[PDB]
Amino acid sequence: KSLRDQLVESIRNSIARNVFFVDGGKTTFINSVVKSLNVNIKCLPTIDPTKLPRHEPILVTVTARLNKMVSDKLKGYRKQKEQWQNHLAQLQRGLHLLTDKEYKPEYFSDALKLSIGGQDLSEIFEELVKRACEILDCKAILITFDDIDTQFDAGWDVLESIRKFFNSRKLVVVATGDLRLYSQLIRGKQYENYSKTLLEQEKESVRLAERGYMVEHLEQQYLLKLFPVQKRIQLKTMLQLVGEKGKAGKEEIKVKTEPSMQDIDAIDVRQAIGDAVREGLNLREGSDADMYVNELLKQPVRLLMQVLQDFYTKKYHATSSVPNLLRNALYGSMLSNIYRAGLNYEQHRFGMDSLCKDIFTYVKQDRDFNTGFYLRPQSESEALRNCSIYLASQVSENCQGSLSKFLQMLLVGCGSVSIFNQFVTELADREKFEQLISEYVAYMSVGRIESASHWANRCCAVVANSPNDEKIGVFLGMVQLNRKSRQNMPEGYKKFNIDTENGLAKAAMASSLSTVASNNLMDFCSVFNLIGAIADISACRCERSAITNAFNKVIAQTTCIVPPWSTEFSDAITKVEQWLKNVNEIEIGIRPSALLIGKVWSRFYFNLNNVADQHKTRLYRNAEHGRMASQSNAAKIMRFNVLAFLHAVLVEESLYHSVSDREYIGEGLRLNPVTSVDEFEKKIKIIGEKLKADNKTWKNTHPLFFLLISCPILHPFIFPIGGINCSVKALNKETSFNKLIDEIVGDKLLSDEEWDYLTKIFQNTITSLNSSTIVGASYDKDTPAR
Template sequence: MLAHQTDPHITIDLSASEQNSQIEPNNLIQSEAFTKLTNQIKERLINRKSSESYSPALGNSQVFFIDGTRGAGKSTFLSAVYNALCYGSTAQIKELKLAPLQLIDPSKIHIREHVFLSILYKIKKTVDSHNRENSQYRSDSSNDTNEHFRNQFKQLAGGLQLLNEEHNPLTNIDEEVFLDWGIERAKDGVELAKNFQNLVELTCKILDANALVIAIDDADTNFKKGREILELIRCYLDTSRFVVLFTGDMKLYSHLVRDHYHENMGDRLYRQDPSRNVQREKLIDHLEDQYLLKLFPINKRIQLPPLWIHKSIDNIFLTHSIWGAEPRKLDVVVTRIITDGLRLKSDQDIQLFREFLYKQPLRSILQLLNTCAPYLVSENSSITPTILSEAMRAMVQGSLYKKEVDIDALGAGDTPTLIDAVFRLTLEDGEFDTGAYLRPQPKDESLRKSFAALSTEVARLCENSTANTIKYLLQGPGSVALYKDSRSSMKIDDDETAQGRFKNYLSIGREEDALNWAWHATPVIMNSTTPSTPIRCGVIRLSRSTGSNSNATTIEQILTELELKPDEELPAFAFTLINVFDKDNRTYASIFNTLGLMCRLLRDTNKNPLTHVTDELSKIRPTPTISAPRWSEGTGPEDSLHKEDETEPSYKTESKLFANLAEWITETKRQEKNVNPSAILIGKIWTRLYFSLINVAQNYSTEAHSTTGAATIMEFYALCVINAVFVEEHEHHYSSNRNPDTSNNFRKNPKQSGSTINSKFKDFKKGDYPLTTIIGGCPLILNLLPNIITYTELFSALSASEKNNPGVPERTHAYINLASIPRQARKNKSNNN
């Protein structure tokens, strides 16, 4: 896995990362741990007194525990240390005179075969091999030693029977024979440890070694064998004649030992005397700590840290067979993969994902790098979200399974699966405002890993697609925010049931477009099953009838009159409307309908752009009607969608709005190649938009603005959309060439003055802001603004048409402002009285 070293650099050959080739110690990432371990072994062997004898009470343990989480590189490290100690060519290593005995992988030993027998077999095989190789040099003394070895080996036979707990040769025999054999059997058991120590001493003498080296790899992967090996070390290997290298995760061994003591206590004690259960738990805590401290003293534990806290991370380099001979810095490659694959711009966000990746197991990091390496042929190559999403998805697959994410559907690019996962996991995380940024920050490890994988999926979904970006914006972060605000009004106690009803109503997890979401979001925002203020986040309630107020005018009356006049055009405001069927039928204007309609217009089609615009707009004029959510009735509502009037309108296809939309669609297809949003960017756009809309709604709900018309309120809703996309794209869009602007004026949201937003567009360049150009420049948005001098710079910067000004005529804007809003109708009525 690791190739060569250029002092003081460590170089990792990614193309060889899947090979099991031997690794030199100075090429180990954990070279400091190797030095610490070998120094401890050398110090103990050199300082050991030759007269020191084995003590069953104290032990002379040389058991070294190599601690690390799964995938931390323990097996690689263990193999390198074992080979270095046993076959190393340096003078320091040779001076230790260590003889290799066995590198044990307990998972490959038959479940019924005791590990002790495997060690005895290796001792005998090693001695026999040594004798064969040195037969011509054997003397009488060496023959006597070997004969002594064979006799000593035979003395173990009786005690070895005791290792098989299921076999008892004393069953059903004569009493006198039982006594004789029982005493002999007890003697064999008592003498087994001593006889084994004598055998090891003879082995070291024959091999001319100070100690035998045993390496045991990941015994914690098999609980039965793990417990057996721990007892083997405690009873037989805690001697200065063994150097035992032991790998694993201390957390797993802690569970293993605890399970052992719980098993010994038995359920019967817990049931018969529950009053002392707390005392028993404390006793088990103590026994667990002391057992592990005796086997693995603190000063003999070697920690293999993750890359994140590696002191020399800047000195780690990467090579690959297709890269050429020049190594590349690990940190540079990782930063490039994160930046390109996740479409990040902010240094803070890049650092956050970099930290997350370095905290993963070493095996995971190397496999992800190896997957990406073929796409980084030159140092200027970049990784696409598609490549990184595949690697990230495989790296955290277990966490995605745990969180019940359909990995196959996710890999196939299924949008409903992605949005459903983002919705569920963000709610589980509990960070409703910022959770949908999908930063790897949750406390729960599986959530953290899932967020990282979903971030790459969002970048892949939205790459070069404005429609997917808007769809995810609304259905992902938008659904989370709406659920948070509507949960208190849902008369459902169970959270799971409430989530299910909410998802069904907004079609989360189903293949529905963004306009369908926008329609259903309107009554959720307005809480239409109960009385509410007529102006809320991005939505305005409009009167359907004038009632007794002769001064009031309905929006339908205004729009119908505009349609009939030959010199007037239907404004974009007409396509913001939705009727909600409830106890009282209600009409709403929503800025979210405008965003949803954008997605429909950007669908792939073989139609002429103008024909496509006409067809799509005709489907939502007259205004559609949907059912309100009846959260309190215990069942999700039957979703109905119909039109108030099925008479097809006679559109003027030569109208300015239709022509501008057709031109916008064509221009968007050219601009979309530069659209590269991240989950963070889209999340931030939603957050800024959502709270901006709330502020505008609150402002125009006050008594001071009680006469402000629907057109003016919708004008500021539109400014909120333009401003939110522009500000966040400036700071977080991957392809934006502009440095972040920290001035208060730039980040200021619209509230009462449109000139504040207009001034931001004086030096606007479309090439630097593709998302703002497309969304903010859509005629459906710009036509909600009056064609007045206040928006001169904004129209000039964003309009796709050089011939037609996209703003709504000032007289039309003023006419729509006459549309009755319920609170205005009530005020006018009270004034007339």
């Protein structure tokens, strides 16, 4: 607005090149300026080359328009007319010069018939405009030329007319578009200045070098003369018209969302976009939503407006999900983006299956592999930055109200990249790079996911297929116990015998188990495998029977191959099914955001790195019984793995879950319990006290963490034999931790007798892994004294 205003003043104070350019609706600005001028100058009807015949001279177009203006100003109320037609006829008969594909000699005499000498339509034009001014009573005239985005080759002819006819004093020219394109135009057009034979002859690198250098020299040489910089128009953007983060807001606009808003209910523009993004993405009003909405404002006015005019209208239609309606708009808004991205186009093939491989694919064009699961528009690619937004919207849409679907997403989309970059990037060249990623995808069936246990058991083999540095079968979140119990080894350490476990614990560690079929057929135990089983079983249904079926399938020893580059349960069933009847009803409010699940995976994966580094050098012959922090066993390692899992869960959920408007984690150095649970216990205490003070429950806030601690398959691992720190300072904290667990769950997980036995037939707890021998662990030396 101030833009075109200053524009008008600039034109008016110019008469006292004459080319002005608006960088880029561009047509909206130009035409608004058009009416603004309606210092006496006559405006000319806007000229769009793309609205003009493929073979026309802008000269003829302008001539016809000038005809209408001069004639009607003259049909109003004579000498001017006939002389004008004299100029007109001179134009016309000299006009062929523009069109003719040849030179015919007969026109030499025509040129021999009568202020410089010849038949120059340029001058013809300048006296034409002279007479036109004489009639119209304006000091000059403006010619206008529309954006050539639809067909940018047209503007070239306008360009020649520029050099050839508009080199006149009473003329002002206005052009619109993106000068980069014009640069593209001229760079090519010069190339036709070359002799082809030249081009196929001197095709050596140095020669191409000077040839280009001259070409760009000429390109700039032109663009200066065509578009003097003083006359170029900036065209502030919406972000340049709207508060960046509130320290701005130069003349806010306001746009409508529902029908009425009688000029007072207009809900900002920044505010409305923030609403759309946050509640259509489960984003909360944290510091990301603003940056995303700014990276939504940066896109052209048309795209942003249409995507912000479709969402709310269809909201109105539906109301007579926000995350799904939001992805609906982005779907069309970035379809060409996505389409060129090669992403799922089949709206009938969206699912949660295609989603995870969509995240993976995006994380291959964006490179990253470090936080690409964050899906934030960090890429330079202006097509990838918005594909990120659309994919985040779709992930939220898929995960709305689904605990096990959230589990599936976090596993497949998040951990797949985490495992690749740290574990599959040592193999991959570029074509070999995409091949390697292809067979990686094939091994995992990513996007084509079979089951969470499937993905976990593939990930177990992947994890096993690398680590060195003492070859300890104690990885990020797994513990490689010995299956062939034949190794001359001390104390009560032994192999893992599942038969020694009972009830809800035997099946628990059997499901956390991973028996890969590399060749050794090593039996791995991984928090990854147990999490996959939990995700598999957490949204099956409320049925009692199929729950048992999935129970067996997950607990049934399933055997998988390495990637080619290396009666007794009716109680646990009832407990698990009660946990499911809780989960399937309290999960309907889960609204995890892609950023939320990105943070959860990042934190837990790195806590797994910590627990994998800190626990390998703690395996001693007496490390069993895990009384101290210097005694380690497979049981304590896996207990700390699950502890890292749940601690990251709670921390990231309190921080970033969209259901939460404020933080109860507290402003502190969030650190992880690696060899002690002090961090987790203290954070739980603070969160619980905050919930009590603000009159909230762990179901209202932290429902996912609540259900995760409420999983019957996880409880045996929390306080396993050999993994509870028996130091007095450790004992009081672990006791408080158990009390907090019982309070939050609403139930006492472990009996007082069980707790005292542990702290000095035990179902609901692991009793075999403490004495289970981990392959590779020497168990030579003992724990140091003092």
